[PDB]
Short mmCIF file of C-alpha atoms in Angstrom, two decimals:
data_model
loop_
_atom_site.label_atom_id
_atom_site.label_comp_id
_atom_site.label_asym_id
_atom_site.label_seq_id
_atom_site.Cartn_x
_atom_site.Cartn_y
_atom_site.Cartn_z
CA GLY T 341 -33.73 -3.96 28.33
CA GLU T 342 -30.78 -2.45 30.20
CA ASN T 343 -27.89 -2.04 27.74
CA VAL T 344 -24.80 -1.19 29.79
CA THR T 345 -21.08 -1.17 28.98
CA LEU T 346 -19.21 -3.58 31.26
CA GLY T 347 -15.69 -2.41 30.43
CA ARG T 348 -13.31 -2.37 27.52
CA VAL T 349 -10.45 -4.65 26.53
CA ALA T 350 -6.95 -3.49 27.39
CA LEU T 351 -4.36 -3.46 24.62
CA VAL T 352 -0.63 -3.59 25.33
CA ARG T 353 2.13 -2.54 22.92
CA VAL T 354 5.86 -2.72 23.59
CA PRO T 355 8.34 -0.63 21.56
CA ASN T 356 10.54 -3.64 20.72
CA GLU T 357 8.41 -6.69 20.03
CA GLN T 358 11.41 -8.77 18.94
CA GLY T 359 12.83 -8.46 22.45
CA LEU T 360 9.83 -9.97 24.22
CA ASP T 361 10.71 -13.10 26.18
CA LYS T 362 8.70 -16.23 25.42
CA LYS T 363 6.59 -17.88 28.09
CA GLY T 364 4.54 -21.01 27.51
CA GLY T 365 1.26 -21.20 25.65
CA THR T 366 1.87 -18.51 22.99
CA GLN T 367 2.51 -15.86 25.63
CA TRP T 368 5.17 -13.22 26.21
CA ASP T 369 6.33 -10.89 28.95
CA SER T 370 8.07 -7.52 29.02
CA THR T 371 11.84 -7.48 29.50
CA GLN T 372 14.52 -4.72 29.69
CA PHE T 373 15.15 -4.74 25.87
CA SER T 374 11.53 -5.07 25.01
CA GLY T 375 10.74 -1.72 26.63
CA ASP T 376 7.93 -0.92 29.02
CA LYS T 377 4.37 -2.06 28.41
CA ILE T 378 2.43 0.84 26.88
CA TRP T 379 -1.21 0.53 27.96
CA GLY T 380 -3.72 1.85 25.44
CA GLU T 381 -7.16 1.32 23.98
CA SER T 382 -7.94 -0.15 20.58
CA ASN T 383 -8.28 2.05 17.48
CA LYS T 384 -6.48 4.89 19.29
CA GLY T 385 -3.25 6.39 17.99
CA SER T 386 -0.92 3.65 16.79
CA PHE T 387 -2.97 0.74 18.14
CA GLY T 388 -5.01 -1.60 15.97
CA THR T 389 -8.65 -2.61 16.24
CA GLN L 99 33.93 7.63 15.58
CA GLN L 100 33.96 4.05 16.93
CA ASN L 101 32.11 2.35 14.08
CA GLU L 102 32.48 -0.89 12.14
CA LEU L 103 31.41 -1.75 8.61
CA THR L 104 28.93 -4.53 7.88
CA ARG L 105 26.65 -5.82 5.13
CA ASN L 106 23.68 -7.73 6.57
CA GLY L 107 20.54 -5.74 7.16
CA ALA L 108 18.87 -7.72 9.94
CA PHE L 109 17.92 -4.60 11.89
CA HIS L 110 15.34 -4.10 14.61
CA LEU L 111 14.25 -1.56 17.22
CA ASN L 112 15.24 -1.42 20.87
CA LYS L 113 13.34 0.18 23.75
CA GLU L 114 14.73 3.61 22.81
CA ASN L 115 13.49 3.36 19.19
CA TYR L 116 17.01 3.12 17.77
CA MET L 117 17.57 0.87 14.76
CA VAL L 118 20.15 -1.66 15.96
CA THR L 119 21.60 -4.98 14.83
CA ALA L 120 21.14 -8.35 16.55
CA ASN L 121 23.96 -7.56 19.02
CA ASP L 122 22.21 -4.33 20.14
CA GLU L 123 24.82 -2.37 18.16
CA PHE L 124 23.50 1.02 17.11
CA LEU L 125 23.33 1.96 13.44
CA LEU L 126 24.64 5.29 12.12
CA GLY L 127 23.05 7.68 9.65
CA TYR L 128 22.99 11.20 8.26
CA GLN L 129 21.02 14.08 9.78
CA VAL L 130 18.47 15.61 7.39
CA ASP L 131 15.71 18.03 8.40
CA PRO L 132 12.00 17.31 7.84
CA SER L 133 12.07 19.96 5.08
CA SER L 134 15.67 19.47 3.93
CA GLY L 135 16.67 17.75 0.71
CA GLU L 136 20.13 16.24 0.36
CA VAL L 137 22.41 15.55 3.32
CA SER L 138 22.74 18.57 5.59
CA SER L 139 25.34 17.41 8.13
CA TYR L 140 27.78 14.75 6.93
CA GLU L 141 28.84 13.52 10.38
CA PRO L 142 26.97 10.25 11.06
CA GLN L 143 24.77 9.69 14.09
CA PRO L 144 22.30 7.00 15.20
CA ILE L 145 18.96 6.87 13.40
CA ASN L 146 15.98 7.73 15.60
#
Protein backbone atom coordinates (compact mmCIF):
# COMPACT_ATOMS: atom_id res chain seq x y z
CA GLY A 1 0.00 0.00 0.00
CA GLU A 2 2.83 2.41 -0.82
CA ASN A 3 1.60 4.85 -3.48
CA VAL A 4 4.64 6.76 -4.72
CA THR A 5 5.25 8.96 -7.76
CA LEU A 6 8.02 7.52 -9.93
CA GLY A 7 8.54 10.56 -12.16
CA ARG A 8 6.70 12.54 -14.77
CA VAL A 9 6.78 12.46 -18.56
CA ALA A 10 8.88 15.11 -20.28
CA LEU A 11 7.24 17.16 -23.02
CA VAL A 12 9.25 18.91 -25.73
CA ARG A 13 8.03 21.80 -27.89
CA VAL A 14 10.01 23.52 -30.62
CA PRO A 15 9.05 27.02 -31.86
CA ASN A 16 9.03 25.96 -35.53
CA GLU A 17 7.57 22.49 -35.90
CA GLN A 18 7.61 22.68 -39.71
CA GLY A 19 11.40 22.91 -39.60
CA LEU A 20 11.94 19.66 -37.70
CA ASP A 21 14.04 17.16 -39.64
CA LYS A 22 12.55 13.71 -40.17
CA LYS A 23 14.25 10.63 -38.78
CA GLY A 24 12.92 7.11 -39.23
CA GLY A 25 9.99 5.61 -37.39
CA THR A 26 7.78 8.71 -37.03
CA GLN A 27 10.50 10.61 -35.21
CA TRP A 28 12.05 14.06 -35.51
CA ASP A 29 15.06 15.96 -34.24
CA SER A 30 15.80 19.61 -33.56
CA THR A 31 17.62 21.59 -36.25
CA GLN A 32 18.81 25.23 -36.61
CA PHE A 33 15.49 26.42 -38.19
CA SER A 34 13.36 24.38 -35.89
CA GLY A 35 14.63 26.30 -32.87
CA ASP A 36 15.85 24.89 -29.59
CA LYS A 37 13.96 22.17 -27.72
CA ILE A 38 11.88 23.81 -24.99
CA TRP A 39 11.56 21.35 -22.11
CA GLY A 40 8.31 21.61 -20.16
CA GLU A 41 5.69 19.65 -18.28
CA SER A 42 2.22 18.81 -19.53
CA ASN A 43 -0.76 21.09 -18.87
CA LYS A 44 1.62 23.97 -18.05
CA GLY A 45 1.61 27.22 -19.99
CA SER A 46 1.31 26.53 -23.71
CA PHE A 47 1.77 22.76 -23.48
CA GLY A 48 -1.02 20.25 -23.92
CA THR A 49 -2.11 17.40 -21.68
CA GLN B 1 12.92 48.92 -48.12
CA GLN B 2 14.13 45.73 -49.85
CA ASN B 3 10.79 43.99 -50.26
CA GLU B 4 9.07 42.01 -53.00
CA LEU B 5 5.38 41.52 -53.70
CA THR B 6 3.76 38.09 -53.67
CA ARG B 7 0.35 36.43 -53.49
CA ASN B 8 0.58 32.95 -51.95
CA GLY B 9 0.01 32.72 -48.23
CA ALA B 10 1.96 29.59 -47.33
CA PHE B 11 3.48 31.16 -44.22
CA HIS B 12 5.08 29.56 -41.19
CA LEU B 13 7.15 30.44 -38.13
CA ASN B 14 10.91 30.27 -37.75
CA LYS B 15 12.93 29.89 -34.55
CA GLU B 16 12.61 33.63 -33.85
CA ASN B 17 8.78 33.57 -34.10
CA TYR B 18 8.73 35.60 -37.32
CA MET B 19 6.10 34.76 -39.92
CA VAL B 20 8.12 33.84 -43.02
CA THR B 21 7.55 32.19 -46.39
CA ALA B 22 8.94 28.82 -47.52
CA ASN B 23 12.28 30.44 -48.48
CA ASP B 24 12.72 31.86 -44.94
CA GLU B 25 11.86 35.30 -46.33
CA PHE B 26 10.45 37.57 -43.65
CA LEU B 27 6.99 39.06 -44.03
CA LEU B 28 6.28 42.76 -43.44
CA GLY B 29 3.43 44.40 -41.55
CA TYR B 30 2.17 47.52 -39.84
CA GLN B 31 2.91 48.45 -36.22
CA VAL B 32 -0.22 48.83 -34.07
CA ASP B 33 -0.26 49.08 -30.28
CA PRO B 34 -2.13 46.61 -28.05
CA SER B 35 -4.64 49.41 -27.34
CA SER B 36 -4.41 51.22 -30.68
CA GLY B 37 -7.07 51.10 -33.38
CA GLU B 38 -6.16 51.83 -36.98
CA VAL B 39 -2.58 51.84 -38.27
CA SER B 40 -0.30 53.96 -36.09
CA SER B 41 2.99 53.85 -38.01
CA TYR B 42 2.73 53.30 -41.76
CA GLU B 43 6.30 52.10 -42.30
CA PRO B 44 6.21 48.28 -42.60
CA GLN B 45 8.23 45.96 -40.40
CA PRO B 46 8.32 42.19 -39.78
CA ILE B 47 5.43 40.68 -37.84
CA ASN B 48 6.40 39.26 -34.45
